[PDB]
Amino acid sequence: PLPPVESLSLRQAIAQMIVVRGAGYLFDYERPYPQWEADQTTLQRWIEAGIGGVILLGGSAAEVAQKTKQLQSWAEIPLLIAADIEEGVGQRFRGATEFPPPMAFGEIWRTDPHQAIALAETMGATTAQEALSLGINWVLAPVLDVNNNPHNPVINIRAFGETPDQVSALGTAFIRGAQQYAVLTTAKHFPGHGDTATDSHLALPTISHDDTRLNTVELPPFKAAIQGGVDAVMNAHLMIPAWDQQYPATLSPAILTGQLRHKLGFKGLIVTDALVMGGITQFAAPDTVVVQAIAAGADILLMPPDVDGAIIAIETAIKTGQLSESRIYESVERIWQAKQKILTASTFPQGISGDRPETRKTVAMVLERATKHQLVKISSFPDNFARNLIVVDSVLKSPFLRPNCPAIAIPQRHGYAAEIVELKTLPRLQLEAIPTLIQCFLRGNPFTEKLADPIDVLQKIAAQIPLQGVIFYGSPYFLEALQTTLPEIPWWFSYGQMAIAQAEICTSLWAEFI
Amino acid sequence: LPPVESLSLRQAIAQMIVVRGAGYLFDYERPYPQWEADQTTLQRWIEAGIGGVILLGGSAAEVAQKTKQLQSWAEIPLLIAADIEEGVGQRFRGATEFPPPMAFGEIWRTDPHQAIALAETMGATTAQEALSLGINWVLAPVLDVNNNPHNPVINIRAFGETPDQVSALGTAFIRGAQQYAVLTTAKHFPGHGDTATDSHLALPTISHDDTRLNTVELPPFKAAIQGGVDAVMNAHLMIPAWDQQYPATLSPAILTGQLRHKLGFKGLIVTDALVMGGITQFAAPDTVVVQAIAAGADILLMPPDVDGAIIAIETAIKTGQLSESRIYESVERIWQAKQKILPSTFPQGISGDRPETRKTVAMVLERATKHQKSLVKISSFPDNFARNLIVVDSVLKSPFLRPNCPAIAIPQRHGYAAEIVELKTLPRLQLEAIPTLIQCFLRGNPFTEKLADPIDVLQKIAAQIPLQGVIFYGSPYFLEALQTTLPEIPWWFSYGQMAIAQAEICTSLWEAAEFI
Ligand SMILES: CC(=O)N[C@@H]1[C@@H](O)[C@H](O)[C@@H](CO)O[C@H]1O
Ligand SMILES: CC(=O)N[C@@H]1[C@@H](O)[C@H](O)[C@@H](CO)O[C@H]1O
């Protein structure tokens, strides 16, 4: 059960407003990012001190099930446990179901809205159901950003489309689908990251548009989701000069309170986007940030750089009259209302879809319909006489490439043998001139300063080398420039980078056990 | 367990079979569908009375789920095996990963007493964590003596280059694991140590006489037999001196004569995986299986066709080419082992952060390490000014490389930006000229045609580039060539490829805003 609010000490109350960051992996030494991800002693200590929630990245699903069990066992007040699963729990945690990125659904809506809505619906339902089963009760999604800028490095295919109505529908469908289970759902990133070429992880972006446009494009998904009863809204770190010329949205009273809590009438959790992000740490000190953000009306501080001193800063702000105890508890009340929703509810593996056919088919359907082509069928050759050239953003970021994955195995049956290189390395690579297939896995994500421009390196290569064809996985936006730069060579494209998206494409083109 | 005679001849036969499966809970997750039984097949074969399963892949948590699942379908408890040579964590992450056996041999050169005590800790921690996950059959230690520095498949998987060295370390590992109820397996009799040919690809030819075999190859295996190793796995090797017509796997002279009789091994005699090209190029799947049992094997590991093996056996019993009493002899020995294996529940039993365990791993890596000069430091540069060139065998085969791993992160802080490339791509890559650090993780393993040989391509790069240093992880065998061919470039070497090994070496060369 949940204890009455006023029974908390001012410190326990403040602590609730803080969400820290762990790893899915059980042990300290497995942590990929020890700078940002607390160890067990620090995590237990925080939870026993009343920390409000934990956001987890990394680990197999079976592990997260084990982590969240452990984490919850240290908590007197049940923890909000969040993970960013946009593409489905499978995106974050191997062993759960990964869906194709939202922009894939975007396609289907253009052509067939009634069906697109319904897929997003079960996209949300399944995401919501598997999450509960891993012990994750807070889904930070849907992304409601309207992507108007082909060059947007951070949002890109994470988005349901380029127009507000497309995004409105497909985003509320997802919320509707998840609403079938008890998990918080999160609209992000207010008031939309849609238009920039700049990534707020790297630096502070500025969207120039005025209030008229802002209500015309950026806002409606958000309006829709709030009327929808989305549980939480995560703002981005952005300069919105038409609303505030001083502060980024994270720190602005006019934005978080004036525009959002008041004008749009959002009664849920206003959540700062991660507070360790380059965009914001560059703007102000970690303590200025926490206090100013609460001032601005944020209910939840997501991943503050210094947690121990942040609580202390808020305590000191409260004594110096810069904030008041009542303010803190208004935030607790909202936190209670959401912790109330999550307490009503799955034991791993039970609830994971797995080999369940109905799910596998839904994933395959979405890929198929969202696909884009020129039909053409390419050449076959004898063993290792040809080259399957796989080009990826980073190799440490390419989990979708695994031994015997369709993108490798299939072109191999046909004589092309795989070479895997990073797009940044390619230009400096001297290729044997032999029939060659190029598959680029490239898309936008967090920590992408600018998108991939394979077109130049490719044209150089079409002249140097006998291209059979080029497959693009991930971002669509470079097709326009591909058809224009190289009409000669046929191309195929899919939104999915995953094994089953690979299988579909590669098939259409036509011994090791350990 | 039920009396041995309660089993139908079909179930007796079935106990002699161990099939391959993946740790991942679901079918679509299997990286090797051809060899790895889907969940339906696995359930059918188990209910038919199959002897055991061998698992590959999955995190440790994933695997505990799997094994619980598999034992539930079995009336006779299954042997469940994985090849955890390097610690359960080699296979299923989340469990403990030890540096490879050779690193223990390295220590043994200068300080045998420690090296033996460390090896025993490796054995005990490995048995302990295995039990935790539901893995009762540890296929290890490898007893091969690696004489041949060019040996592709064994390489650093061996505890060393001499019989006395392997016997000591190998038996320690055994005595360590003997603190828990698990089967230990010696591999791969009569030792895969000296060949340049990987038996996964082709049938190795072994020209050594009987005397040489007893001098080098065998003595480790005897030490383990007197030490009580529960099972002995045999290699597919043509040893004419022993059998003119058959590989070790299919030869009664070798398995029955040399192993069972001459060495008096009373445990499980296990074939090497029967899907390997070394054996399959030799005979049809059904001949292979019956000739295997003929020669005295108690366990048929991963027969290429399972259902067809059982038929083929039943038939040969009819024609009396095999014998029914001969099937129950092997079931006797399987009964003896299963008697033993009859734990604790995951995450309990997993060492995790236990500082004794973490220090053991760290000490091994640290005492096994090699560097050209007493101590040397590398220059530092401004951000993204220099090059960190990571060279690996295969990118899909390199799980020790993850985002922000020390090998990437540490040089990064000193201004060397990451570039990852496969050794096969390297000689064709024209390098930008900035001071460069090269780290190649290259080692012997299953499915290796030839040992990766960087010496030539490095030498070419060395003349064209301001090379700061070369670091090798894995196989030691090219260091002499490095030292001779590039005496002016400082080098560092470590047996381990994992985070902790990168961390150690890289830190020593000198003295991120990214969260997702
Ligand atoms: C614009 C953007 O990348 N937003 C993400 C947000 O979805 C996520 O929840 C959090 C980190 O977990 O902050 C950012 O990394
Ligand atoms: C020479 C060699 O490496 N043989 C390995 C053996 O180590 C392994 O235990 C077994 C089943 O996995 O068969 C082969 O893959």
CATH of the domain at A134: 3.20.20.300
The alpha carbon dihedral of A224, A226, A227, A228 has a sign of positive
**Which of B144, B137, B135 minimizes the C-alpha distance to B170?**
B144
From the centroid of its chain, how far is CA B384? 38
Tell which one of A189, A237, A300 to mutate to probe ligand 1, the residue whose CB is within 8 A of the most ligand atoms. Answer: A189
The alpha carbon dihedral of A250, A252, A255, A261 has a sign of positive
CA angle B494, B498, B502 (to 5 degrees): 55
Contact, A348 vs A121, CB < 8 A? no
> Are B9 and B154 in the same domain?
yes
Report the phi/psi class of residue A229: left, alpha or beta, with left for phi > 0 and alpha for psi in -120 to 50.
left
Please tell me whether residue A145 adopts helix, strand or coil conformation.
coil
* Contacts for A360 with CB less than 8 Å, ≥ 6 apart: A353, A500, B28
> Are B285 and B176 in the same domain?
yes
Contact, A294 vs A327, CB < 8 A? yes
> Are A355 and A388 in the same domain?
no
| Pairing of the two strands A53-57 and B370-371 | unpaired
Contacts of B65 in chain A (CB under 8 A): 62, 349
- Strand ranges across the sheet with A386-392: A416-422, A386-392, A436-442, A467-474, A491-494
Instruction: Look up residue B202 and give its amino acid.
Output: A
Could you tell me which residues are beta bridge partners of residue A22?
A56
Q: Which atom of ligand 1 is nearest to the CA of A273?
A: 13
Q: Give the nearest chain B residue to A24 (CA atoms).
A: B94
Which letter does DSSP use for residue B4 in this model? G
**Which of A227, A13, A231 minimizes the C-alpha distance to A138?**
A231
> Are B308 and B408 in the same domain?
no
Contact, A288 vs A267, CB < 8 A? no
Give A48: exposed, middle or buried? Use CB within 10 Å, 0-12, 13-18, 19+.
exposed
Residue in B65, B402, B421 nearest the CB of A32: B402
Total residues belonging to chain A: 514
Contact, A132 vs A178, CB < 8 A? no
String of DSSP letters for B377-446:
-----STT-EEEEEEES-STT-TT--TT-HHHHHHHHTTEEEEEEETTTGGGBPPP-S-EEEEEEE---S
Distance from residue B445's CA to the centre of ligand 2 (Å): 10
> Are A246 and A121 in the same domain?
yes
Give B232: exposed, middle or buried? Use CB within 10 Å, 0-12, 13-18, 19+.
buried
State the catalytic residue, choosing from A145, A244, A273, A287: A273
Please tell me whether residue B469 adopts helix, strand or coil conformation.
strand
Peptide bond just before B190 cis, omega within 30 deg: yes
The domain total for chain A is: 2
Q: Which atom of ligand 1 is nearest to the CA of A143?
A: 7
Buried/exposed code over A110-129 (b: 16+ C-beta within 10 A; e: otherwise): eeeeeebbbbbbbbbbbbbb
Q: How far apart are CA B256 and CA B262, in angstroms?
A: 8
Show which of B368, B387, B406 is a domain's final residue: B368
Instruction: Give me the half-sphere count of Cα atoms (radius 13 Å) on the Cβ side of residue B243.
Output: 19
Distance from residue A95's CA to the centre of ligand 2 (Å): 27
Please tell me whether residue B496 adopts helix, strand or coil conformation.
coil
Show which of B349, B368, B387 is a domain's final residue: B368
Contact, B341 vs B77, CB < 8 A? yes
> Are A289 and A237 in the same domain?
yes
- Residue B200 labeled ligand binder: yes
* Contacts for B467 with CB less than 8 Å, ≥ 6 apart: B435, B436, B437, B438, B461, B489
Q: How far apart are CA A358 and CA A351, in angstroms?
A: 14
> Are B342 and B400 in the same domain?
no
A237 is catalytic: no
Instruction: Look up residue B120 and give its amino acid.
Output: E
Buried/exposed code over A49-85 (b: 16+ C-beta within 10 A; e: otherwise): ebbbbbbbbbbbbbbbbbbbebbeeebebebbbbbbb
Tokens 């759960």 identify what position? A96
Give the ligand whose atoms come closest to the C-alpha of residue A235: 1
> Are A425 and A342 in the same domain?
no
**Which of A98, A91, A100, A104 minimizes the C-alpha distance to A58?**
A91
The radius of gyration of chain A from alpha carbons, rounded to an integer in Å, stands at 24
Q: How far apart are CA A489 and CA A502, in angstroms?
A: 20
Q: How far apart are CA A347 and CA B65, in angstroms?
A: 12
Give the ligand whose atoms come closest to the C-alpha of residue B195: 2
Distance in Å, alpha carbon of B150 to nearest chain A alpha carbon: 21
Contact, A20 vs A307, CB < 8 A? yes
Q: Which atom of ligand 1 is nearest to the CA of A155?
A: 1
Distance in Å, alpha carbon of B62 to nearest chain A alpha carbon: 5
From start to end of B209-254, where are the E strands?
231-234
Q: Which two tokens stand for residue A247?
A: 């502060």
Domain range for B344 is 1-368
Which letter does DSSP use for residue A386 in this model? E
Show which of B368, B389, B423 is a domain's final residue: B368
CA angle A109, A111, A117 (to 5 degrees): 25
Helix (H) or strand (E) holding A336: helix A325-342
Please tell me whether residue B500 adopts helix, strand or coil conformation.
helix
String of DSSP letters for B144-199:
-----TT-SSSGGGSS-SSHHHHHHHHHHHHHHHTTSS-EEEEEEET---S-SS-T
Give B114: exposed, middle or buried? Use CB within 10 Å, 0-12, 13-18, 19+.
middle
- Annotated active-site positions of B, please? 200, 272
Q: How many CB atoms lie within 10 A of CB A463?
A: 9
> Are A457 and A344 in the same domain?
no
> Are A384 and A513 in the same domain?
yes
* Contacts for B492 with CB less than 8 Å, ≥ 6 apart: B369, B370, B371, B372, B469, B470, B471, B472, B505, B508, B509
Peptide bond just before B347 cis, omega within 30 deg: yes
CATH number, domain containing residue A457: 3.40.50.10870
**Which of A510, A466, A470 minimizes the C-alpha distance to A494?**
A470
Q: How far apart are CA A129 and CA A349, in angstroms?
A: 12
> Are B437 and B447 in the same domain?
yes
Q: How far apart are CA B403 and CA A507, in angstroms?
A: 31
Distance from residue B461's CA to the centre of ligand 1 (Å): 41
> Are B298 and B330 in the same domain?
yes
Tokens 């390097």 identify what position? B86
Q: How far apart are CA B36 and CA B302, in angstroms?
A: 10
**Which of A255, A190, A254 minimizes the C-alpha distance to A226?**
A190
Q: How far apart are CA A460 and CA A451, in angstroms?
A: 19
